[PDB]
Design a protein around this ligand. Structure first.
Ligand SMILES: Cc1cc2nc3c(=O)[nH]c(=O)nc-3n(C[C@H](O)[C@H](O)[C@H](O)COP(=O)(O)OP(=O)(O)OC[C@H]3O[C@@H](n4cnc5c(N)ncnc54)[C@H](O)[C@@H]3O)c2cc1C
Ligand SMILES: Cc1cc2nc3c(=O)[nH]c(=O)nc-3n(C[C@H](O)[C@H](O)[C@H](O)COP(=O)(O)OP(=O)(O)OC[C@H]3O[C@@H](n4cnc5c(N)ncnc54)[C@H](O)[C@@H]3O)c2cc1C
Lengths: 41, 455, 455
């Protein structure tokens, strides 16, 4: 569950959305959820 | 007297869904209506007009598909049938509302309400009056057109309801007021062959919409033979028993127009007068509207107000929406009228619709925005329909590409707007739309190609 | 000999957009095309098809608005003008394509391209043959009609293209193949007055859509005097040199039918044959479809494939999307094919649109899904349009309220589909839509009432 844009973000950022921070709210992965899995570490 | 839990005054879009909701919320509701259930929307508003407008376009088209090689010779219109058909439509919908109310055991009461105190209403009907003391009350009385003095409504000086119920297509018609109701009813009769003359006092018609949108509408309306006079000052009318002579001063020149009827659509005033609201202490706003909180509660807690008498766009959905919210707050159920935006639609030839901020109000609100516009002309579907006039504008917040407003003028804009409306509520960015594959070849494809431009 | 960087074979929707995003990304692009730019969609596919249907409906409506009091007389159809008009729409759009390419300075080469090796292609332009050396190439050759065994194409045994160019309205037409193309061209001519008989081998026309949707479309075809013969097996056609005799078996019975023309629309095959791909090492499938990865790459790394020659829905938009993905991937952009669904629209009388899963497909996929179905018969605008046959269906994942599929059958379904589509693509729920205020009275709002039903 994610907006096309968010999916694009992970893509260009070389992240595996399949296993990325499901930040919740709706139960979806947000741009920052990607940032967390990335910049977080 | 008669005791009740939640008293609802008015069975229009706001009153009836509020009565329905409240009943479903376990409350015992009594709905008071003086006329037809359904209110303005079903009886003399939304439905009748769209019905009429729809028939007029079937006429515009039959008679003008020349370019496509279809030549219809002698296209007739039996307005009697047109009205019969319109009649049956309205009857189906009102029949429905009538059903919905009973199917949720709401006691409908025919009579005119009046607040005797902050907890009791006198309902009059015939030579009988009955007192009802309620636990809660929701005022949903709607609005009505403005009778301009020296334009007092008569057999030939009409209001929106009168133009809707005309027995036969007038040869001529003068329209005072270029708002949606005016432009709509004006265009409709123009399609049927009536020589229309719309006089708006302001510099431009359709105040609310961007001037560009108004431009396209005027251009095509002139092709239909309609004449549009802005900055016009209607002075009055000498009603003959066979037409009406309207006098008005436009740009320092007094002129005269003989017509069959005159339609005064200069606005609508709230039905908040002689209701006792003054007495029970309901603080009204400068324009007669009733001030309410985020839960539509008036200055008297146990009293709510919704729809047309409350601030905001006088649209059916605002009404039904605030209707729901109200009953919720009544039933404790936490709620607030915090929606993101209500789309507005106008059924002019090139259909109009908008939702969210216009480039203007966004900028003046100090918001950083970009405006992306795409022409229907560069679209295969539009070309196929042979209607290239129109465009889609998208205003996105520059500081994140989030969509905040969208405006469409062209075919099916009232349907196309739905998509853009969802995005705006979802806080979707222009890219979210551009990445989505829309159908082909369709008018919706345009939204995708517009967001494209916004990147 | 002539050196280049990115060679694009084919100027179709997938071809030219690919040739454009690439140029956008600084790539030196050379596009090859044996015929006209725009490919199938513009010249003999989407555009002409919808244009002919539009004209046909203007005609249907002109002669049949008797219910709204509109009665014409002697409505003439001039097919020669119809064709002229359609021809201009096409020529208009074609120019756009040529313009876009040249504007982005894409090298345009006229000729039949042939792959000599993994980095070279020779294009034969008649007795001419030039050789273009490239770095990477994109093959977007599209597809073509399947010629049935005993139905050899001629001026009387047509393919979609043959029907789109008919010089006159046929007295009678036999359509072999009840798919969207067969149903669209069949209905259009049924609108112009032609006696149309559809022969589908399967048990139901519009195979890829719900049986309910087809039932409605068939019911209207019947109203028009269209005879739909399902479970029929077409055996052959003898061109009587003045018409055609078609013999088909059905329920044991072997019958023959005479018609002025026969239209074969059983399927389209990939244009991957006689291209040299087999020598170049490009892995394909038995049917002829090229094996491709998430970035539309073939087995030969510098060779990409998009459009009808690769797997997926045979749609202009699926082609265009991949076109972009290809060029981006070529450039370095970590692009990939990522969409959750693509909408498909059929321009039948009650037009229909679908996106996502059909209720059945969902459960057969092993998914607990609920399905909400809302009728246009209830919607106010539908009543005004006086087309109340139709509905909207929402296929919702019971486990999270996430919408995964939607089907609409009724007026403007092609435009209303966009909203539901954007919802699927972004993973929204029935509540997300139900909590969005739609326009009233419009058709797009049915989505709001259906989601309400889903909740
Ligand atoms: C011709 C025209 C076209 C319009 N087109 C559209 C459009 O297409 N889209 C849109 O959104 N809006 C449209 N509107 C406006 C829209 O109809 C209103 O916004 C909507 O009806 C408001 O709903 P409501 O419940 O507030 O009021 P109403 O529908 O006005 O309901 C008010 C009810 O209160 C009853 N009432 C009043 N006083 C009393 C009393 N004392 N006792 C008992 N009953 C009482 C009235 O009889 C009435 O039935 C149009 C209006 C007009 C006139
Ligand atoms: C009647 C009909 C109706 C349709 N309706 C729809 C619709 O409503 N919506 C929709 O999305 N799709 C529709 N389609 C499908 C649509 O036409 C295709 O999906 C789309 O055109 C595919 O584009 P493409 O770029 O893959 O190939 P094409 O558009 O087929 O173009 C491929 C190009 O390659 C050229 N070519 C082939 N081989 C070579 C070669 N070796 N050298 C040089 N040139 C070559 C061909 O001339 C052609 O121009 C319809 C198709 C038909 C026939």
């Amino acid at each position: 569950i994610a907006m096309p844009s968010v999916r694009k973000y992970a893509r260009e950022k070389g992240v595996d959305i399949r296993l990325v921070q499901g930040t919740g709210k709706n139960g979806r992965v947000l741009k920052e959820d990607i940032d967390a899995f990335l910049a977080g570490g | 007297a008669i005791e009740t839990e939640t008293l609802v005054v008015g069975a229009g879009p706001g009153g009836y869904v509020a009565a329905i909701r409240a009943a479903q919320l376990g409350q015992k509701v009594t709905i008071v209506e003086k006329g037809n259930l359904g209110g303005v929307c079903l009886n003399v508003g939304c439905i009748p007009s769209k019905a009429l407008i729809s028939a007029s376009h079937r006429y515009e088209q039959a008679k003008h598909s020349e370019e496509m090689g279809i030549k219809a010779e002698n296209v007739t219109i039996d307005f009697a049938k047109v009205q019969e058909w319109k009649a049956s439509v309205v009857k189906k919908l009102t029949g429905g509302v009538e059903g919905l109310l009973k199917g949720n055991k709401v006691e409908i009461v025919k009579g005119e309400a009046y607040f005797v105190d902050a907890n009791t209403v006198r309902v009059v009907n015939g030579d009988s009056a009955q007192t009802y003391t309620f636990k809660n009350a929701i005022i949903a009385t709607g609005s009505r057109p403005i009778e301009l003095p020296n334009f007092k409504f008569s057999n030939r000086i009409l209001d929106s309801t009168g133009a809707l119920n005309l027995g036969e297509v007038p040869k001529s018609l003068v329209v005072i007021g270029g708002g949606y109701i005016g432009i709509e009813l004006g265009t409709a009769y123009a399609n049927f062959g009536t020589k229309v003359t719309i006089l708006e006092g302001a510099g431009e018609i359709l105040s609310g919409f961007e001037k560009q949108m108004a431009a396209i509408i005027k251009k095509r309306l002139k092709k239909k033979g309609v004449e549009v006079v802005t900055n016009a000052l209607a002075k009055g009318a000498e009603e003959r028993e066979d037409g009406v002579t309207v006098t008005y001063e436009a740009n320092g020149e007094t002129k005269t127009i003989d017509a069959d009827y005159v339609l005064v659509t200069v606005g609508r005033r709230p039905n908040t007068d002689e209701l006792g609201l003054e007495q029970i202490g309901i603080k009204m706003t400068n324009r007669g509207l009733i001030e309410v909180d985020q839960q539509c509660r008036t200055s008297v807690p146990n009293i709510f107000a919704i729809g047309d008498i409350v601030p905001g766009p006088a649209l059916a959905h605002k009404a039904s929406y605030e209707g729901k919210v109200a009953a919720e707050a009544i039933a404790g159920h936490p709620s607030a009228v915090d929606y993101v935006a209500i789309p507005a639609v106008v059924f002019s030839d090139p259909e109009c619709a908008s939702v969210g901020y216009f480039e203007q109000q966004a900028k003046d609100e100090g918001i950083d925005v970009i405006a992306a516009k795409f022409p229907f002309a560069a679209n295969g579907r539009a070309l196929a329909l042979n209607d290239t006039d129109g465009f889609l504008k998208l205003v996105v917040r520059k500081e994140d590409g989030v969509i905040i407003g969208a405006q469409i003028i062209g075919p099916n804009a009232s349907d196309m707007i739905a998509e853009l409306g969802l995005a705006i509520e979802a806080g979707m960015t222009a890219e979210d739309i551009a990445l989505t594959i829309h159908a082909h070849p369709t008018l919706g494809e345009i939204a995708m190609e517009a967001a494209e431009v916004a990147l």
